[PDB]
């Protein structure tokens, strides 16, 4: 698929989640982001579709206090405004 | 399915992972245990089938430093020696 180049901040989160590249496909970006959320345990204990990022860089990146993985559209928009190139 | 009654220690781990009962089926015990491991992040970052419990009560409970989720037989044996009743 097409390669995307994340901004420095998004790149640092993916890297801390184990990514080794600087260019990925959207599926790798999504995969690595779930690992970051998992490792940091930002999701809600009871309602596990809610991710709380108020005091985490993910909140600075997306600019929200939280989000639902059950709202795919808003999520993709937050990721997209954070790709310096959606076609590398 | 049959109900099992975990020992006090195993009970405290399940409870901390969100369990509300004192009697469960083996599937609930397994479900709650994965949540405990998940919440505490005891699994290995790279080889995610390896659970490190050397400095966690799970290690005291099982009596091991680690284990592989890829060895189902040893796991069930560790759980079984920790049920005061495998039929409640």
């Amino acid at each position: 698929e097409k390669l995307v180049q994340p901004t420095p901040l998004l790149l640092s989160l993916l890297k801390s989640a184990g990514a080794q590249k600087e260019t990925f496909t959207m599926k790798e970006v999504i995969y690595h982001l779930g690992q970051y959320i998992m490792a940091k345990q930002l999701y809600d204990e009871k309602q596990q579709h809610i991710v709380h990022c108020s005091n985490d860089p993910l909140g600075e990146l997306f600019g929200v206090q939280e989000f639902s993985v059950k709202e795919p559209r808003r999520l993709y928009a937050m990721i997209s405004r954070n790709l310096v190139s959606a076609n590398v | 399915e049959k109900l099992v009654q975990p020992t006090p220690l195993l009970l405290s781990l399940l409870k901390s992972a969100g369990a509300q009962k004192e009697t469960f089926t083996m599937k609930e015990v397994i479900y709650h245990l994965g949540q405990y491991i998940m919440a505490k992040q005891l699994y290995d970052e790279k080889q995610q089938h390896i659970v490190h419990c050397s400095n966690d009560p799970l290690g005291e409970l099982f009596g091991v430093q680690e284990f592989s989720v890829k060895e189902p037989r040893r796991l069930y044996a560790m759980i079984s020696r920790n049920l005061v009743s495998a039929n409640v």
């Binding site: 999504i30 779930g34 959320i37 998992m38 999701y43 596990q48 579709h49 993985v69 795919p72 | 998940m38």
Partner: peptide
């Protein structure tokens, strides 16, 4: 349904 489950269903 756990986080992993939902994340894995991303449309």
């Amino acid at each position: 349904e756990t986080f992993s489950d939902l994340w894995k269903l991303l449309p």
